[PDB]
Design a protein around this ligand. Structure first.
Ligand code: HEM
Ligand code: HEM
Lengths: 727, 727
């Protein structure tokens, strides 16, 4: 029709812009100059729209897209209307099955680059030269919930990276904790079914807090280590940018001379580590179920690119048997105090997709997708994974040509004798469809193994044993890793752990399950169990009080890299602040505030009790971003309240509640001049307290005190005051 | 190993029990004696479990289900482990595509029964006798969100009913408002795409508060009427039990003599109409995303069975053109003040399913499944629907034999010449697979139409017109029904409509879209338009202030049946109350309370600061159902606080906050004896106020006040005081 506004405000600028400033858009329209080899090769499937006629899928122009063909304008719809039937038919078949686990996920494009050559330890081409740039596609996700479930639930997180290398696709499919719940792949459907919604009524969504999950845990102690990680704050991250990444299993690195080294993969966040606190996370699933997906997308649009460092834990083959635990057991970690992480390269995420369904929903990752330079090991969880990812993709993606969907295709060449199958795209001209053949002179040909561009050959490991269905005796210890984890947390992190267990077990209906869990906790640590017991109204038996604790792990009694906050690594860039306005804000306060924030790279959200504009005291006009109710304190990292006509909002229930909720969730609060009246709303002493920044006006140290607290992420010293406070 | 507790507390009693007292279970173990003819025919495929051996799907007993087959205890997994591959293969293929629309839903079994014979107006066998019972299967749902989205979002609700009649299956596939958003089926994909998550980032989940939906509404004024319904409290029901249901389309009833009568279908809830308030509903999507599903399962387990009256709006064929609106326009309703609802029968839901996937997820409903005695009309929306439901079940359910999935099978006989297709169950013995045939003497055979047991014949309506793609000019009126709806609401209902519009338009990023929507509202009612506009910081122009309001609907100024609350119809039976405990409860108070609750069928939940138990002053050991934080006020209808050691919970942040939320959300609160100390937390009344029940002790008088308030659902008179409460 020609319906866009003349002034053209229906379309966002194609340049970096702060969260909420402009409408978000497909990646190639927001950042058309952000390119890589993978992005460039997708140009053959991209479709525009501007200046084109509206057509059927066969290319016939459509004259009327508002009506069906009928006999009379009030008559029956005719069967001969092929335009209507095509339109509704495509609509009716839009959906494909979601992923059996990790259905909910958010993705982006980027690139990886090695810091130096690793030709000494591996012959993988993508790690061989500091100038080789490798394009990546990454998907972050939850585990339990469906694709329409919420982002900030309590759960393990997935971290999958598809490396488009020159010698093949390499998929590193990891998680956000260094261990998994079970030892053998044979139990995966059992563990998955226990955590997922119960089979009679399909409840509950996105939660482990129900009878069957805890039943399975109390009968299978191997799950205790990863259960400790999920009940800690590791289970509710602040953002996909601020969590750690792990491969979990021990793999092999193979060099040109044929030597094998054992490796555990690590992803280290450059924005540091941060998480939410339970009541904020749970509330946040209602006020904004898409908070992580939204933050990821907006961070890239604003230029705050997620950056991670790839790291390796390296173990010589001769050291296979030197630890207290088995290296092939995925319920056990390798303490950084024993085997340091070597920082090897970096990944940067700098462009969003164009179409979620086509790039994200259809992407397929699989741990079996490795390259020459790498190899597997006998970890029994990894072993059964190799079977599963190829099999499941046959029904999810509809056939064996899933590698022909544009986001999954390699950028390097691929030729073989495989043919046909549903949805076949490639037209092969090879006269032969088998080898050995003389009709095409045996092409394509096998290629011997070598130091570069050679064929894949498996490491020749020795196997000796009988065919048995049995667990290795070295896999039989379940309590010392959990205890190592428990003793490395800070005191306030231990408290959050206790509260996660108490909360979750309180939702378990059958009381005997709660009691058996508590018993299992008494084998890990007594203080932990006494504390969980008292919140559930349980008494420990005298026998439970004398259980002997498990041993140290190779002499360690703590490892600080297991805590989120022991060794702080905060980075305030990309964090966001809430500024609550009034109808006559002191513009001198506002300019000192906004300029300090921009200097550190922190975003501001200007809030008010209605939408539209507000006029500052010097006549300056401020556009309002959202209302107090529309952008709750759950969404910001800290609150600033500037001087001005404070009586405008001193009596508004939402403005006050905004300060009580943030105060409760331990975020820093700043009050300028008469905005100090608000201290009475949160029971702050006249004297003041750590975490509340207050001054006569918003000037000098005001902003610097505020930004120091933001780098410390939350105000842990206030824990003691929040139990009162009705928020 | 891993067995049940000695006391048998792992299993639920097979008798009606209140919500939360026991673990929920599959319907056939919870109510073995509840039967109907559909439930009994499902006996062929129900599978048990106690006392059987674990096997593969080929029936081979499994010796060890904890491990994979490997070469040695720490060796590689063997390809020949067929037990392992069968187990993982089935898991890898568990998911099927979710429903294109209405993916999130909850179902139950029950039966329908007519009040009188309706053979003067219809030859429909299920309506011909008061003593004839028809088994039904009903599915309630949201529209927009995926299958793992939350229950209490703002959206339209689906109300689908499958009738297993003796002359075929009849599906009455309706909604909870009497009109739809659009007129022609050709625009369905356009409207659904605008409301669903945006295509570049897949945000937002289960919400219409985003740019593409308001864009579409502002350019298609036909949608305004159902947008009014959605922005009112009709968009957020308290329960599937407390909402109305409609077929929307005008349909036809045909009697034995061939006479036709136009009909609109209604469902009237015998528990009455009731809804949440927005703040509550949004927060409840985070505290329990599965609330409507839970509540339905639990009401059926408690014996508070969902019951509805089927009603008909009947209009003679000669009165087709006697209204100011076209009867075939699905964006127009038929005021009950003009054509009353005749009550025809009752439907009762009395049993949950055994397996949610097998019965709820594979069920297929379709508005084209009618039986002799019913017929269609030329409503252009209805007409397009007939193509769609059959088409989409071919991919969702895998082939053309979906009528052979047990939940979908007819209980009457079905025979024809259709053969083959994927997963074909029935083995045909008929030597012929075509007709006419002489080799089987032509059976099965066609049956002529008649009064009972006849073949289907369409009503022979005259069709006169040219083949055009054109909207009837009679459908070109968009503003008088929304005006009629606005003027029939109570004043507090009106405020909530304004608040829903303001809230959603505040989330639209492109400001010109808000302005256009507000412009459209000015054609309906200038008071409504002005209220929304003030909240968005928008000034109406002089031009807009002089828009002539639309005309009346056949002389009506208003119709009270369009409001939820103008004519009170509430029932307290099945509602739930929170009782906040302390460590020394006055047993006398507690017994007066529980007795009265039990007399009216009101359930109770005893809450505390920890789980386990408390002892009342006389020793009546009280088991705690959940904590304050664990079962928030959002999930109950009213709050009671008994006397006792009140200093136990007087300074508990959670217990004070609990009363402030219930107060904000207009729920009745009862305070006894020293519990009156809590009046300071909700800072109000010295002499008391309506909505707050106080007394020295909990007696008969106290309880009757509280029960009279609960029958009115919420305390509307408290609206003007909530704006100042910080909660
Ligand atoms: C170390 C333990 C494991 C980790 C870290 C892990 C990680 C992941 C991640 C991140 C995804 C989502 C990929 C995406 O974004 O599309 C995924 C999917 C999946 N995983 Fe795993 N997983 C583990 C164990 C297993 C096991 C033992 C099995 C089965 C034997 C399994 C079967 C699957 C399947 C079937 C999918 C869906 C794949 C698809 O639909 O493309 N996983 N896993
Ligand atoms: C008055 C308007 C409409 C109403 C009241 C309505 C109602 C419903 C309901 C209640 C369901 C869910 C059934 C279940 O529980 O499985 C549903 C699903 C569906 N609707 Fe409609 N709908 C309407 C308009 C349309 C239109 C115009 C189309 C297409 C032109 C359409 C296509 C579908 C499809 C394809 C499904 C999924 C069916 C399945 O997967 O089994 N609907 N609709």
């Amino acid at each position: 029709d020609s319906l866009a506004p003349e002034d053209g405000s229906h379309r966002p600028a194609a340049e970096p812009t702060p969260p909420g400033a402009q409408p978000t858009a497909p990646g190639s329209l927001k950042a058309p100059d952000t390119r890589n080899e993978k992005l460039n090769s997708l140009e053959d499937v991209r479709k525009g729209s501007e200046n084109y006629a509206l057509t059927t899928n066969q290319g016939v122009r459509i004259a009327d897209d508002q009506n069906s063909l009928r006999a009379g304008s009030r008559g029956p719809t005719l069967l001969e209307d092929f335009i209507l039937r095509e339109k509704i038919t495509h609509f009716d078949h839009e959906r494909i099955p979601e992923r059996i686990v990790h259905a909910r996920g958010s993705a982006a494009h980027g690139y990886f680059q090695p810091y130096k050559s690793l030709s000494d330890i591996t012959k993988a081409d993508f790690l061989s030269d500091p100038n080789k740039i490798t394009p990546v596609f990454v998907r972050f996700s939850t585990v339990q919930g469906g694709a329409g479930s919420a982002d900030t639930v309590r759960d393990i997180r997935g971290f999958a990276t598809k490396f488009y290398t020159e010698e093949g696709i390499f998929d590193l499919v990891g998680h956000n904790t260094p261990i998994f719940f079970i030892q053998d792949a044979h139990k995966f459907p059992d563990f998955v079914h226990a955590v997922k919604p119960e089979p009679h009524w399909a409840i509950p969504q996105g939660q482990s807090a129900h009878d069957t999950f805890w039943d399975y845990v109390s009968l299978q102690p191997e799950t205790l280590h990863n259960v400790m990680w999920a009940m800690s704050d590791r289970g509710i991250p602040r953002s996909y940018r601020t969590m750690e990444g792990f491969g979990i299993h021990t793999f092999r690195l193979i060099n040109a001379e044929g030597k094998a080294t054992f490796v555990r993969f690590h992803w280290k966040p450059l924005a540091g580590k941060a998480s939410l606190v339970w009541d904020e996370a749970q509330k946040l699933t209602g006020r904004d179920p898409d908070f992580h997906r939204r933050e990821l997308w907006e961070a890239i649009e604003a230029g705050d690119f997620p950056e991670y460092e790839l790291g390796f834990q390296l173990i010589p083959e001769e050291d296979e048997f030197k630890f207290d635990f088995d290296l092939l057991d995925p319920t056990k970690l390798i303490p950084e105090e024993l085997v340091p992480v070597q920082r090897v390269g970096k990944m940067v995420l700098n462009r969003n997709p164009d179409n979620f369904f086509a790039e994200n929903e259809q992407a397929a990752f699989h741990p079996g997708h490795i390259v020459p330079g790498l190899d597997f090991t006998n970890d029994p969880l990894l072993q059964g994974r190799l079977f599963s990812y190829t099999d499941t993709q046959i029904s999810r993606l509809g056939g064996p040509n899933f590698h022909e969907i544009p986001i999954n295709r390699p950028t390097c060449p691929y030729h073989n004798f495989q043919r046909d199958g549903m949805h076949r795209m490639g037209i092969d001209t090879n006269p032969a469809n088998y080898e050995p053949n003389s009709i095409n002179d045996n092409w394509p040909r096998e290629t011997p193994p070598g130091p570069k561009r050679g064929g894949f050959e498996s490491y020749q490991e020795r196997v000796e044993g009988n065919k048995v269905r049995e667990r290795s005796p070295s896999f039989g210890e379940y309590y010392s890793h959990p205890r190592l984890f428990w003793l490395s947390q800070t005191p306030f992190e231990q408290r959050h752990i206790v509260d996660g267990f108490s909360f979750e077990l309180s939702k378990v209906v059958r009381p005997y399950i709660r009691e058996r869990v508590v018993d299992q906790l008494a084998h890990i640590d007594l203080t932990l169990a006494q504390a969980v017991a008292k919140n559930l109204g349980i008494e420990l038996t005298d026998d439970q009080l004398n259980i002997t604790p498990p041993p140290d792990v190779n002499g360690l009694k703590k490892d600080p890299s297991l805590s989120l906050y022991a060794i702080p690594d905060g980075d305030v860039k990309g964090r966001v602040v809430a500024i609550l306005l009034n109808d006559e804000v002191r513009s001198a306060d506002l300019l000192a505030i906004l300029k300090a924030l921009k200097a550190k790279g922190v975003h501001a959200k200007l809030l008010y009790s209605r939408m539209g504009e507000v006029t500052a005291d010097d006549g300056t006009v401020l556009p309002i971003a959202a209302t107090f109710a529309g952008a709750p304190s759950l969404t910001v990292d800290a609150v600033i309240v500037p001087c001005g006509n404070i009586a405008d909002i001193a009596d508004n229930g939402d403005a006050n509640y905004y300060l009580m909720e943030a105060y409760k969730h331990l975020k820093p609060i700043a009050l300028a001049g008469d905005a100090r009246k608000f201290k009475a709303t949160i029971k702050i002493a006249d004297q003041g307290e750590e975490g509340i920044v207050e001054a006569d006006s918003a000037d000098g140290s005001f902003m610097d005190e505020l930004l120091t607290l933001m780098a410390a992420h939350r105000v842990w010293s206030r824990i003691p005051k929040i139990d009162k406070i009705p928020a």
